[PDB]
Amino acid sequence: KLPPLAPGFLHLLQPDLPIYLLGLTQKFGPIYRLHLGLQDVVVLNSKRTIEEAMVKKWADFAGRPEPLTYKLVSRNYPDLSLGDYSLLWKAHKKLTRSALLLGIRDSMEPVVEQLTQEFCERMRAQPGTPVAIEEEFSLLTCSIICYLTFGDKIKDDNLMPAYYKCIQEVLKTWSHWSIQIVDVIPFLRFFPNPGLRRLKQAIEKRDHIVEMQLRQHKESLVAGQWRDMMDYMLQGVAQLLEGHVHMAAVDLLIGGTETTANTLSWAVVFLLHHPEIQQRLQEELDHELSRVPYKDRARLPLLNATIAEVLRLRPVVPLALPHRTTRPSSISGYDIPEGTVIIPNLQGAHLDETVWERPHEFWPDRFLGKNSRALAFGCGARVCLGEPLARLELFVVLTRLLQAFTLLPSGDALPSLQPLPHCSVILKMQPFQVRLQPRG
Ligand code: HEM
Ligand SMILES: CC(=O)[C@H]1CC[C@H]2[C@@H]3CCC4=CC(=O)CC[C@]4(C)[C@H]3CC[C@]12C
């Protein structure tokens, strides 16, 4: 007995897809089948069902599907984030996980704190002027992941301009409806598509960039020493090959910029709507205090509760990434065949009233480590690779923003909390501007 099948196609065209999927749980329960595109796919809409699949049945769902764009972005192969579950993939992830956790065990804090301070200095240029803060956070987060992957040469040969441009374009093209439409309806591959040709030209570099940096790290590399994440990964390689390192850097770079930047932007808009919270956060910092290190963190309980709420209420990767069943299994008492694609609806799951009371409301006080955790980063074998670095950025950036600045609306009106309807992969807010006034 398979999970119940909701009628229709293509439910993709629904305005707020994760919220549309949540609405279907009323009639069909937390777990059901439906036609996303032309394909039959099962969707999970509660923490209990997601954790049963990903945490309890670890290996059973761990896999990835392989539609055309997965192949197109890694022709030379082989990707981590889109790679299927295998023994070699596990070794792949283990290694890059070690580069983030041990390779930059030190550095990770100082590099983050140095670049956010440059960001704050850059914001002091023209106080009380309308700022495109989306683009500013994007430059900050991209800089951070670049410096940690590639090292000193980035602003030294002054490479952030070109690297930012490239990284932005790669994700911009891939996540567009053209390109993504070939994945859901395979036969449109033979159709003419401006988008695919734009994507191929955007893969050449990123590949030129990552390869140039790969070879530059290989010369000047000292065995036993590591200045960045690439130095680390190169020395754990040569069945894991340098091609694994290449794609691992790509996954770090693209996975690490727009995700943390949009989460930061979400926190901003939420803060703007709740001057009650911003003030309470300004009062908390001024009592600990000249930076408040990540080591402390617990000394600011409402800030961690606020961060957790933004992650809970606006998870930047709302439908995670698609999972593929590796062997015949079950979720919630229903038979789940091998090869079946699974969508963990993370945004919908966080909106469960049974787990979180008054669920559509922004309420940091709810987390004052108080009961029941969200999963903006997912869970199980496919957990976000960059979570530890992500949570550090959110702490350091917002902690250094709230002291030294007061967030004010750009216009006389408030910027909408409503995320734009046709989102692919990343949950983006409507383009807004902010006013930063010194002393907060
Ligand atoms: C707060 C910001 C972030 C959020 C909410 C987030 C969320 C996620 C989610 C939901 C997944 C997929 C989980 C699944 O498939 O079940 C994921 C995967 C991934 N994220 Fe993130 N992420 C963030 C920041 C980052 C950063 C900073 C990096 C790298 C420096 C990164 C790199 C990755 C990679 C490489 C994967 C794929 C891992 C795999 O397939 O096993 N992310 N992220
Ligand atoms: C979680 C997330 O949004 C990130 C993490 C890894 C990222 C992917 C890494 C591999 C990749 C390479 C490309 O050239 C196109 C975009 C993609 C397909 C990336 C899109 C965004 C992803 C899916």
Swiss-Prot record:
It is found in: Endoplasmic reticulum membrane; Microsome membrane. 17alpha-hydroxyprogesterone binds at R206. One of its GO terms (molecular function) is 17-hydroxyprogesterone 21-hydroxylase activity. Disulfide bonds: none annotated. Changing R366C: In AH3; very low residual activity. Heme b binds at R64, K93, H323, R382, C384. Changing S86F: In AH3; non-classic form; loss of steroid 21-monooxygenase activity. It is a peripheral membrane protein. Its cofactor is heme b. GO terms for cellular component: endoplasmic reticulum membrane. Changing E284K: In AH3; simple virilizing form; 4% activity. Its EC number is 1.14.14.16. Changing R382C: In AH3; loss of enzymatic activity toward 17-hydroxyprogesterone and progesterone. Changing G37E: In AH3; no activity. Changing C142R: In AH3; loss of hydroxylase activity toward 17-hydroxyprogesterone and progesterone. One of its GO terms (biological process) is steroid metabolic process. Changing R299P: In AH3; simple virilizing form. It catalyses: progesterone + reduced [NADPH--hemoprotein reductase] + O2 = 21-hydroxyprogesterone + oxidized [NADPH--hemoprotein reductase] + H2O + H(+); 17alpha-hydroxyprogesterone + reduced [NADPH--hemoprotein reductase] + O2 = 11-deoxycortisol + oxidized [NADPH--hemoprotein reductase] + H2O + H(+). Progesterone binds at R206. SUPFAM superfamilies: Cytochrome P450. Belongs to the cytochrome P450 family. A cytochrome P450 monooxygenase that plays a major role in adrenal steroidogenesis. Mechanistically, uses molecular oxygen inserting one oxygen atom into a substrate, and reducing the second into a water molecule, with two electrons provided by NADPH via cytochrome P450 reductase (CPR; NADPH-ferrihemoprotein reductase). It is linked to Adrenal hyperplasia 3: A form of congenital adrenal hyperplasia, a common recessive disease due to defective synthesis of cortisol. Congenital adrenal hyperplasia is characterized by androgen excess leading to ambiguous genitalia in affected females, rapid somatic growth during childhood in both sexes with premature closure of the epiphyses and short adult stature. This is Steroid 21-hydroxylase. It comes from Homo sapiens (Human). The gene is CYP21A2.
